[PDB]
Design a protein around this ligand. Structure first.
Ligand code: HEM
Length: 419
């Protein structure tokens, strides 16, 4: 993939609108392209793309139907638009249908048990406050590494009890995975690097499993982390011996929580910068933080879509999706659908229906980590409000190349503390 200027959507025949282009978000053309699809081709077939042909489903109501109807639309074998590079396919329950999906999700869902998240609030808030206190207030800095990636990486390490000093690896491996050119149009096109990483990652999870079992056998009390949970349950105490399940489950937790958390933490600042009256509203009414977090997640939509395959011919939106066709559920478009949300492109932190967004999906795959993400975002903004009278974005944000992740690689921020 090489970036070129994306033309006005009005220059295109409807059949030539290709929303798999991974520069549509960066260039700001995604809003007009998806509005044209919602209005005039809400169930749209693209015959020609670098990823092969695919349907786009772009209205909120129709996306709900596809996401909930796993008897008609399969999540197998992959949920990104393209294909993983050869040798890198791993089975993850995000790309599995019931009943097996339900079985595999049950084996890990305890890691985000509400009682466990509540016990970790002090740690999350301490990390958040320490990170914010460390930021300079006399010069701008890049928020993406300093805050969003920093906090996400610590959280991911805690979730796995992954060696804290190596947490940068959970994220580097994960980035090169979720950013495969063949899968998402991301910038990673070297299969040699992905082979090195996927193997390093698999070896690292195996060493962690053995270190944790040796520590448990030696009398270490079990913790909140996923490995401890897997080793405490009869069904999964032997998960090492099922390598596809073991590697797939652990990889899904890390990839699932990595750039989603990161880009939600960054995106709230970008939304405030575009709608600065909302920050004055927030400072005057801090009890809006929980609803604001929903509005940040709606407006940002950190994952633009999830993909499905039609299990049979399905009539949708005056169109016949054929058995075997790839069907892309464009959450990024659904969350801007004016049939669902009034003034959808506005960031409105007291929007009463913000919580009804589809950024987590709907149906059996609805995000397992939704409460953990919301918790971290709430604490982030609580701790921001204690410290800063103003936040300024000093340069146009740099947006990531991807058709899947909607995110930022550079967000240059100047802080003004209160007195
Ligand atoms: C604001 C942040 C997040 C967003 C926007 C998001 C988005 C999503 C989406 C769109 C799906 C699939 C929904 C569908 O197909 O219907 C999903 C599933 C999933 N997410 Fe998240 N996610 C976020 C945070 C997290 C975090 C923090 C974690 C882990 C700590 C996580 C782990 C997972 C897992 C394991 C699944 C698979 C659930 C299943 O297939 O049953 N996510 N997420």
């Amino acid at each position: 993939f090489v970036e070129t200027p994306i033309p006005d959507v009005n220059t295109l025949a409807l059949e030539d609108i290709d929303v798999s282009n991974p520069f549509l978000y960066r260039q700001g053309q995604w809003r007009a392209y998806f509005k044209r699809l919602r209005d005039e081709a809400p169930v749209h077939y693209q015959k020609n793309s670098p990823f092969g042909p695919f349907w786009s489903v772009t209205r909120f109501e129709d996306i709900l139907f596809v996401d909930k109807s796993h008897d008609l639309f399969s999540a197998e074998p992959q949920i990104i638009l393209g294909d993983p590079p050869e040798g890198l396919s791993v089975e993850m329950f995000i790309a599995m249908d019931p009943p097996k999906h339900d079985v595999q999700r049950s084996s890990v869902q305890g890691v985000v048990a509400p009682k466990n998240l509540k016990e970790m609030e002090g740690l999350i808030r301490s990390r958040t406050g320490d990170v914010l206190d460390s930021l300079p207030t006399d010069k701008p800095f890049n928020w993406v590494p300093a805050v969003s990636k920093e906090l996400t990486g610590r959280m991911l390490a805690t979730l796995l009890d992954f060696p804290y000093e190596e947490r940068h690896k959970l994220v580097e491996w994960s980035d090169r995975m979720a950013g495969a050119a063949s899968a998402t149009g991301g910038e990673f096109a070297d299969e040699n690097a992905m082979f090195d990483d996927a193997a390093d990652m698999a070896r690292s999870f195996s060493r962690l499993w053995r270190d944790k079992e040796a520590r448990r056998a030696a009398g270490e009390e079990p913790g909140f982390d996923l490995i401890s949970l897997l080793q405490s349950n009869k069904e999964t105490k032997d998960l090492i011996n099922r390598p596809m399940e073991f590697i797939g489950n652990l990889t899904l937790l890390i990839v699932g929580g990595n750039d989603t958390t990161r880009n939600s933490m960054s995106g709230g600042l970008v939304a405030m910068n575009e709608f600065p009256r909302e920050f004055e509203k927030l400072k005057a009414k801090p009890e809006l933080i929980p609803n604001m977090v929903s509005e940040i997640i709606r407006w940002q939509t950190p994952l633009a879509y999830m993909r499905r395959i039609a299990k049979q011919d399905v009539e949708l939106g005056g169109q016949t999706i054929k058995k075997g066709d790839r069907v892309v559920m464009w959450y990024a478009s659904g969350n801007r659908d004016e049939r669902k949300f009034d003034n959808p492109d506005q960031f409105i932190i007291d929007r009463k229906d913000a919580r009804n967004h589809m950024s987590f999906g709907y149906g059996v795959h609805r995000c397992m980590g939704n409460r953990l993400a919301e918790l971290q975002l709430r604490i982030l903004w609580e701790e921001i409000l204690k410290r800063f009278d103003n936040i300024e974005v000093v340069e146009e944000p740099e947006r990531v190349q991807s058709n899947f992740a909607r995110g930022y690689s550079r967000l240059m921020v100047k802080l003004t503390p209160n007195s």
